[PDB]
Each structure stands twice: as C-alpha cells, then as structure tokens.
Chains A and B, each alone.
Chain A
Amino acid sequence: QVQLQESGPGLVKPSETLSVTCTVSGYSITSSYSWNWIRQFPGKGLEWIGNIYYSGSTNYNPSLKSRISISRDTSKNQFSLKLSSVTAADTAVYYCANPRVWGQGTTVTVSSASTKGPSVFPLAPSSKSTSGGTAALGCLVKDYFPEPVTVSWNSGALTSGVHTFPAVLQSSGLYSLSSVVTVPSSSLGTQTYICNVNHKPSNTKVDKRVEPKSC
C-alpha cells in the first residue's frame, strides 16, 4: 500500500541548508516501520543518511551527525531531511524509503551558479536517418543547469522506440543530451512529432516540433 515521493529544491548554494521532503501515501508514518533517507552520488555510490521510526525516534549516520536533522509532520504524513553547511560533495539523488519501498528520488545539486533552462533544437528525419521503412528523428536539449531534464514525445503518447541519452557535462559547465525515436518512415508526411522538455529547476517547459527536412 505504501507509496513514497520526494520533493525539494534542485539547486542549493554552498554553505546553505539543503531540505528534502518525503510525502507518504497509503499508510501512516506513525503506525510502524523506519522511514529512511538515502542518497546516491554521481559516482553511483549509495549512502544511508538516517531514519525516523514510527515512534519519532531518529538515527543519524555518524559521518553526517553534526549537520543533520530528520523531522516529521504527522498531520501531513510527511518526513523531512535537513542537511546544513552543504558543499558540492552533497550533490546527489535523495531517496526516501521504508524497509521495502523506495521513492524515485529527487536530484539536488550544490553550486553557486544560477539555473539555466535548455534550448531545444530539432534533429530532423531525412534520407540520411531512414532505412528499410524505419526513420529516426529527435531533439537536441542543450545548455541547461542543473540536472535533470525530463523528455517526453507527443505529450507522453509516444514511448515506443524512444531513447533519451544520459546527459553529458559540456566544457562550458552546462549539460546537454539528445532524445531520439525510431518511427515508421511512412508516417513522416502524416504524423506530427513533438518533443516536450521539462526542466523543473528553471521552471522551463519547451515543446519542439520535429519536421522532415524541407530540402
């Protein structure tokens, strides 16, 4: 029955306090279980941050004990992590979990740099992206900060054949990725394709129509 969902600012300045919140549905956090915070670093390592039990009792990882608090709001069925005196080393995906179920996580980056929404450019289908009745098309999602972006196609109606590549940090210090999809070549003159790019940290939403090469 338990479902968990993390929320929090995606960008925090160094030396400030990072706050993330877990909203729990389908079960009271006062009934039973530990309610845990865990993080995963860019290097992929996992670290258990701490917990709060159904009783309200807390346990903190000793490596973080001087700059951590976990609290709860039983009236909202939420529990929260505060991490103070943050550095760039605190950049991570933050997950909440009971003993079995984990949330999908929320990405937090610690940096002095301001947020930037992406530019979105079409990767047009043409003769040079078509073979044997299959055509490839896409969107280039360029120059955003910080992670992540979400990319859908046709407002979520197109999922088959979609590949959204991992972001790469450019030499500028800004992220870039491409999202591509393979579709029937017969559909190109007829079916509209739009990539929908959401960058929550900058509250940027972009729709980009991807039309066949008109030359």
Chain B
Amino acid sequence: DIQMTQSPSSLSASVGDRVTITCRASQEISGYLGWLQQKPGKAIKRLIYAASTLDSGVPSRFSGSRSGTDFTLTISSLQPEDFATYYCLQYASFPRTFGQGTKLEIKRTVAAPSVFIFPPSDEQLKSGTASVVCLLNNFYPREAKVQWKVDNALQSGNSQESVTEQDSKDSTYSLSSTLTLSKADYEKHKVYACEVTHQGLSSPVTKSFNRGEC
C-alpha cells in the first residue's frame, strides 16, 4: 500500500518554540495529504488538506508544506492548547493511510505536586477489598514517583498509576495512585502513607493517615 512514515513519535517544546513533524510517503502522492489533530475529549480535527491549505479557523502558526514525497507540519509560536497527537493522512490512493502519529507535549516551568490522600470509604469496606488513593495535583514534568508504605513497610505489586493528559491552560499533569489491599490486610495495619518524589521536590513529601481514627 502507500505507506506514510511519520517522525518523530513524540516531541516536547516550550511555549513560543517551533516544531516540525515530517511524513514521508513510500511513493508519489502528489499533494494529496492532510494533517489531523487529536486533543483529549475532542473529536479529531482536520488542520490542513492538499498539503498546504489551512482550514478556516485554524491559527496561522500551523503550516503545511511539501518537497517531493516529504511532507512537513510546522507549528510555530507554540501555545499550551497545542498539546495533542498529530497525524498525517494520504488520500492519493486507496486505501487511505495514516502516519503513526506524533505526541506533542508543551514545556513549562518545573512545578512540584501538591499531594492529597483518601482512605477507603465505609461502603467499600463492606466488600473484601480496600482501596487507598493518593492524588498528585498540578505538576510538571510528567515523571513522578509514588511509594506506598504500610506500617513503614514498602509496598510493591499492589498499586496502579493513572496520569491525566496535559492541561490545555497551565500545561500541568495530575496523577492518581491506587493501592489495592484485601480488607483482612487493611484492618491488620495502622499507618498508611504515600511518599512522593518529583524533580520539583527537594525532599520526599509524605501524606499519611491512621486507620479507623475518629
């Protein structure tokens, strides 16, 4: 088929920086390539078609061009809302084919997370399982380490992490870490703590609670 090779797979750049995304076609496609932008919670949006025709409403900082079988999307003057995954699509032939995509992150100043902790609910404690949740708010960069401690003992294999997509306004992330314990194990121990390390923290931040305290 006509194969589109998209590079790079991911990018990180500052507000006002310029980025270039490239798609190379395995054979001639004339100028029949479009560029697409996928933002979180939003329908996929076309930015450009015919290699260099901007759709109405799309800011002029988005620029499509071509040289032979090499196609480029150049985004100048990057803004926080430009966080997205970008795809090329060729329509010179059947089947239509997509590039592999480019994930674009917007850089910002290092921001340390604020950390909150949530004990299991009384409702859940009626079941056999207790979930403990540690929440990390509004941080950058995305890399963060959460260590769970139960009565000072380091936990492993019983927690899962989830991270939000980058915020379109302040370019921060938020993270949830969920510790899953059997109710039998939960009611045996007293001190439950999440220890958070991050680039913006000079020392670890620990948030803790004592089980059953009223």
Interface residues of A (CB under 8 A from B): 36, 44-48, 50, 59-63, 95, 97, 99-105, 119, 121-124, 126, 128-131, 136, 138, 140, 142, 163, 165-168, 170, 176-178, 180, 182, 215
Contacts and interface: CB of A to CB of B under 8 A. Distances in A.
A-B residue pairs, 7 tightest by C-beta: A215-B214, A48-B96, A129-B116, A165-B162, A61-B95, A46-B98, A123-B118
A124 B49 contact: no
A100 B116 CA distance: 43
Nearest to B34: A99
Contact of A138 (B42, B97, B98, B118): B118
Given A102-B44, A123-B118, A140-B124, A165 B176 contact: yes
Contacts of B160: 168, 170, 176
Interface stretch (B62-70, B129-137, B182-190): B129-137
Nearest to B127: A119
Given A178-B162, A180-B174, 19 more contacts: A36-B96, A46-B87, A48-B98, A97-B44, A103-B43, A104-B43, A119-B124, A121-B131, A136-B135, A165-B163, A165-B174, A166-B163, A166-B164, A168-B162, A168-B178, A170-B180, A178-B176, A215-B213, A215-B214
Nearest to A62: B95
16 contacts: A36-B96, A44-B85, A45-B100, A61-B95, A63-B95, A100-B49, A102-B43, A104-B43, A138-B133, A140-B124, A142-B124, A163-B164, A168-B161, A178-B133, A178-B176, A215-B214
Given A142-B131, A166-B162, A178 B178 contact: yes
Contact of A177 (B44, B121, B162): B162
Given A177-B162, A180-B135, A121 B123 contact: yes
Task: Indicate the member of A45, A128, A163, A176 with the most B CB atoms within 10 Å.
Answer: A163
A129 B137 CA distance: 11
Given A61-B95, A62-B95, A180-B135, A128 B85 contact: no
Contacts of B214: 215
B48 to A, nearest CB: 11
Contacts of A59: 94-95
Task: Indicate the member of A46, A62, A63, A168 with the most B CB atoms within 10 Å.
Answer: A46
B178 A48 contact: no
B117 interface: yes
B174 A140 contact: no
B116 A128 contact: yes
B133 A48 contact: no
Interface in B16-37: none
Interface string B44-77: 1110010000010000000000000000000000
Interface in B184-214: 207, 209, 213-214
Nearest to B129: A142
Contacts of A95: 43-44
B101 interface: yes
Contacts of B207: 128
A78 B117 CA distance: 48
Given A46-B101, A121-B124, A165-B163, A140 B43 contact: no
A78 B163 CA distance: 37
A124 B100 contact: no
Contact of B121 (A46, A100, A124, A182): A124
Nearest to B46: A100
Contacts of A129: 116-118, 135
Contacts of B119: 124
